[PDB]
Protein backbone atom coordinates (compact mmCIF):
# COMPACT_ATOMS: atom_id res chain seq x y z
CA UNK A 137 0.00 0.00 0.00
CA UNK A 138 2.93 2.39 -0.10
CA UNK A 139 3.31 0.47 -3.31
CA UNK A 140 -0.16 1.66 -4.15
CA UNK A 141 1.01 5.19 -3.43
CA UNK A 142 4.16 4.87 -5.66
CA UNK A 143 2.10 3.34 -8.48
CA UNK A 144 -0.66 5.96 -8.64
CA UNK A 145 1.94 8.64 -8.40
CA UNK A 146 2.84 7.55 -11.91
CA UNK A 147 -0.43 6.13 -13.27
CA UNK A 148 -2.92 8.28 -11.37
CA UNK A 149 -3.40 10.93 -14.03
CA UNK A 150 -4.28 8.43 -16.78
CA UNK A 151 -5.93 5.63 -14.76
CA UNK A 152 -7.92 7.68 -12.15
CA UNK A 153 -7.49 11.30 -13.04
CA UNK A 154 -10.87 12.93 -12.31
CA UNK A 155 -13.60 12.80 -9.73
CA UNK A 156 -17.05 14.27 -10.12
CA UNK A 157 -18.59 15.67 -6.88
CA UNK A 158 -22.39 15.94 -6.75
CA UNK A 159 -23.73 18.53 -4.35
CA UNK A 160 -27.19 19.79 -3.64
CA UNK A 161 -26.19 22.97 -5.57
CA UNK A 162 -24.96 21.06 -8.69
CA UNK A 163 -21.89 19.03 -9.74
CA UNK A 164 -18.31 19.82 -10.46
CA UNK A 165 -15.25 17.94 -11.50
CA UNK A 166 -11.83 17.86 -9.96
CA UNK A 167 -8.47 16.94 -11.54
CA UNK A 168 -6.11 15.18 -9.14
CA UNK A 169 -2.43 16.02 -9.01
CA UNK A 170 -1.26 12.42 -8.40
CA UNK A 171 2.40 13.01 -9.34
CA UNK A 172 3.03 15.96 -6.95
CA UNK A 173 0.76 14.86 -4.15
CA UNK A 174 0.38 11.05 -4.42
CA UNK A 175 -0.29 10.21 -0.75
CA UNK A 176 -2.85 13.03 -0.48
CA UNK A 177 -4.57 12.02 -3.71
CA UNK A 178 -4.74 8.34 -2.77
CA UNK A 179 -6.48 9.28 0.49
CA UNK A 180 -8.95 11.63 -1.23
CA UNK A 181 -9.70 9.24 -4.11
CA UNK A 182 -10.12 6.25 -1.77
CA UNK A 183 -12.39 8.22 0.65
CA UNK A 184 -14.50 9.39 -2.32
CA UNK A 185 -14.86 5.92 -3.72
CA UNK A 186 -15.81 4.18 -0.46
CA UNK A 187 -18.58 6.87 0.10
CA UNK A 188 -16.85 8.57 3.02
CA UNK A 189 -17.79 12.08 1.77
CA UNK A 190 -21.37 11.09 0.95
CA UNK A 191 -23.79 13.36 2.76
CA UNK A 192 -21.06 15.48 4.38
CA UNK A 193 -21.30 19.29 4.46
CA UNK A 194 -19.21 22.32 3.72
CA UNK A 195 -19.02 23.45 7.22
CA UNK A 196 -17.53 26.82 6.45
CA UNK A 197 -17.87 29.15 3.58
CA UNK A 198 -15.89 32.39 3.60
CA UNK A 199 -16.23 34.50 0.36
CA UNK A 200 -12.83 35.49 -1.18
CA UNK A 201 -11.16 32.91 0.91
CA UNK A 202 -12.26 29.22 1.02
CA UNK A 203 -15.13 26.74 1.02
CA UNK A 204 -14.12 24.11 3.62
CA UNK A 205 -15.42 20.49 3.93
CA UNK A 206 -14.65 16.86 4.49
CA UNK A 207 -15.78 16.40 8.09
CA UNK A 208 -18.32 13.56 8.50
CA UNK A 209 -19.34 15.08 11.95
CA UNK A 210 -20.04 18.46 10.26
CA UNK A 211 -18.37 20.27 13.21
CA UNK A 212 -14.96 21.10 11.83
CA UNK A 213 -13.28 18.85 14.43
CA UNK A 214 -13.53 15.38 12.89
CA UNK A 215 -12.21 13.49 9.89
CA UNK A 216 -9.94 10.49 9.33
CA UNK A 217 -7.49 9.25 6.69
CA UNK A 218 -7.04 5.88 4.97
CA UNK A 219 -3.74 5.78 6.78
CA UNK A 220 -5.10 5.83 10.36
CA UNK A 221 -5.33 9.19 12.10
CA UNK A 222 -3.10 11.88 10.44
CA UNK A 223 -0.50 11.89 7.62
CA UNK A 224 2.33 14.06 6.34
CA UNK A 225 2.12 17.24 4.24
CA UNK A 226 3.18 17.01 0.58
CA UNK A 227 4.35 20.59 -0.08
CA UNK A 228 5.53 21.17 -3.66
CA UNK A 229 7.33 24.32 -4.92
CA UNK A 230 5.45 23.74 -8.20
CA UNK A 231 2.00 24.11 -6.59
CA UNK A 232 0.84 27.35 -5.14
CA UNK A 233 -2.47 28.81 -4.08
CA UNK A 234 -2.67 31.02 -7.11
CA UNK A 235 -6.37 31.29 -7.93
CA UNK A 236 -9.89 30.14 -7.15
CA UNK A 237 -10.79 26.44 -7.56
CA UNK A 238 -7.71 24.89 -5.98
CA UNK A 239 -8.18 21.97 -3.54
CA UNK A 240 -5.87 21.99 -0.62
CA UNK A 241 -5.82 20.05 2.64
CA UNK A 242 -7.20 21.65 5.75
CA UNK A 243 -5.28 20.67 8.89
CA UNK A 244 -4.10 21.61 12.48
CA UNK A 245 -0.50 22.59 11.89
CA UNK A 246 2.20 20.56 10.13
CA UNK A 247 1.51 16.90 9.27
CA UNK A 248 -2.02 16.69 10.63
CA UNK A 249 -3.89 15.87 7.42
CA UNK A 250 -6.99 13.68 7.64
CA UNK A 251 -9.96 14.22 5.34
CA UNK A 252 -10.77 17.93 5.55
CA UNK A 253 -9.91 20.10 2.57
CA UNK A 254 -10.64 23.54 1.12
CA UNK A 255 -11.61 24.74 -2.31
CA UNK A 256 -10.01 28.17 -2.72
CA UNK A 257 -12.02 31.17 -3.90
CA UNK A 258 -9.15 33.63 -4.66
CA UNK A 259 -5.26 33.60 -4.69
CA UNK A 260 -4.05 32.90 -1.13
CA UNK A 261 -0.21 33.11 -1.09
CA UNK A 262 -0.31 33.09 2.72
CA UNK A 263 -1.33 29.32 2.61
CA UNK A 264 1.55 28.27 0.29
CA UNK A 265 3.77 25.93 2.24
CA UNK A 266 1.28 25.18 5.03
CA UNK A 267 -1.39 23.27 3.09
CA UNK A 268 -1.10 20.37 0.59
CA UNK A 269 -2.46 21.41 -2.79
CA UNK A 270 -3.66 18.21 -4.45
CA UNK A 271 -6.36 19.01 -7.10
CA UNK A 272 -8.31 21.78 -8.79
CA UNK A 273 -11.85 22.19 -10.03
CA UNK A 274 -11.68 21.21 -13.72
CA UNK A 275 -15.34 21.57 -14.66
CA UNK A 276 -18.09 23.91 -13.55
CA UNK A 277 -16.64 26.55 -11.29
CA UNK A 278 -20.19 28.07 -11.33
CA UNK A 279 -21.13 25.45 -8.75
CA UNK A 280 -18.29 26.63 -6.47
CA UNK A 281 -19.55 30.18 -6.93
CA UNK A 282 -23.07 29.24 -6.07
CA UNK A 283 -21.87 27.62 -2.89
CA UNK A 284 -19.89 30.77 -2.01
CA UNK A 285 -23.03 32.96 -2.44
CA UNK A 286 -25.04 31.23 0.29
CA UNK A 287 -25.57 33.15 3.53
CA UNK A 288 -23.57 32.19 6.62
CA UNK A 289 -23.57 32.70 10.39
CA UNK A 290 -21.02 34.86 12.21
CA UNK A 291 -18.77 31.77 12.60
CA UNK A 292 -19.12 31.19 8.78
CA UNK A 293 -21.39 28.25 8.60
CA UNK A 294 -23.97 28.23 5.78
CA UNK A 295 -27.45 28.92 7.20
CA UNK A 296 -28.71 25.76 5.40
CA UNK A 297 -26.70 22.69 4.65
CA UNK A 298 -24.46 22.55 1.59
CA UNK A 299 -23.49 19.00 0.92
CA UNK A 300 -21.69 16.43 -1.12
CA UNK A 301 -24.44 13.96 -2.03
CA UNK A 302 -21.91 11.55 -3.62
CA UNK A 303 -18.83 11.15 -5.79
CA UNK A 304 -18.34 9.69 -9.24
CA UNK A 305 -15.51 8.08 -11.12
Ligand SMILES: [Cl-]
Nearest residue numbers: 149169170171
Ligand atom coordinates in the same frame (compact mmCIF):
# COMPACT_ATOMS: atom_id res chain seq x y z
CL1 LIG B 1 -0.61 13.88 -12.05
Ligand SMILES: [Cl-]
Nearest residue numbers: 199200257284
Ligand atom coordinates in the same frame (compact mmCIF):
# COMPACT_ATOMS: atom_id res chain seq x y z
CL1 LIG C 1 -16.12 34.31 -3.06
Ligand SMILES: [Cl-]
Nearest residue numbers: 235236258259
Ligand atom coordinates in the same frame (compact mmCIF):
# COMPACT_ATOMS: atom_id res chain seq x y z
CL1 LIG D 1 -8.90 34.04 -8.48
Ligand SMILES: [Cl-]
Nearest residue numbers: 204242243244
Ligand atom coordinates in the same frame (compact mmCIF):
# COMPACT_ATOMS: atom_id res chain seq x y z
CL1 LIG E 1 -9.27 25.04 9.54
Ligand SMILES: [Cl-]
Nearest residue numbers: 196212291292
Ligand atom coordinates in the same frame (compact mmCIF):
# COMPACT_ATOMS: atom_id res chain seq x y z
CL1 LIG F 1 -12.20 30.10 13.71
